[PDB]
Amino acid sequence: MPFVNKQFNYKDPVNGVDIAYIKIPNAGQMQPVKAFKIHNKIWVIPER
Amino acid sequence: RIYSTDLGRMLLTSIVRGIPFWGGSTIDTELKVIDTNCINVIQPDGSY
Amino acid sequence: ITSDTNIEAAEENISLDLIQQYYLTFNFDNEPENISIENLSSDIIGQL
């Protein structure tokens, strides 16, 4: 019963479901960044 | 650690089910999602 | 002052047992689905 139901490492290969490069809203063009879906509607982007 | 506590469990649950409203439609009889509430996830095959 | 003038209830201080009252009647069952939405543009446009 954990809130994050998967063990996530930053070197895990992308799969497009919970580990993938993404682009969010931006003022202009943005470089995609690797992000991790830790729970439903909850994403984490380990980037400055 | 937040989800382990009772209060934090409630807080995360409320956050998850608080989906941003589909208020993007100029027509009152339609429901349109707002783009800024979404992201683009790049799939392995190259589609997003 | 009217005969219909509403009398207000108390203002209970937020105590731990009231938090437990809401915790025991909280619904943790339903979580909104990650539905399939129509694909947006490649670059999402938006500012803070």
Epitope: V14, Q29 | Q43, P44, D45, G46 | -
Partner: nanobody, 117 residues
């Protein structure tokens, strides 16, 4: 989903090259694409990538040296290399993802093109 590359076999350092990658089964301007090279007896290295919006991103290897272009009408991805170096030797593929560093399930690849410098 078919990808076939075509690029010059060899040239000694100090020159240039144009690699091509012809696609079939989809529209090349609608998916993120990448260029990735593999040196013999080693893993893959992300060379470049191109967005469906036409924006291209190149990694540490050959930034300012290589440029990634794409022709929508021809449905063909181009890699214009200049100032090649001996450490750029390997087999070059046009991978189907963004920053494609390994083989990922559901991802399409090409057979490769030999480049020796």
């Amino acid at each position: 989903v078919q990808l076939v590359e075509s690029g010059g076999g060899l040239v000694q350092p100090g020159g240039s090259l144009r690699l091509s990658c012809a696609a079939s089964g989809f529209t090349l301007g609608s998916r993120y694409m990448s260029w990735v090279r593999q040196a013999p007896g080693e893993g893959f290295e992300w060379v470049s990538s191109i967005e469906p919006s036409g924006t291209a991103w190149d990694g540490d290897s050959a930034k300012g040296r290589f440029t990634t272009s794409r022709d929508d009408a021809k449905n063909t991805l181009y890699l214009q290399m200049s100032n090649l170096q001996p450490e750029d030797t390997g087999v070059y593929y046009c991978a189907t993802g963004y920053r494609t560093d390994t083989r990922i399930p559901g991802g399409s690849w090409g057979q490769g093109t030999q480049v020796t410098v």
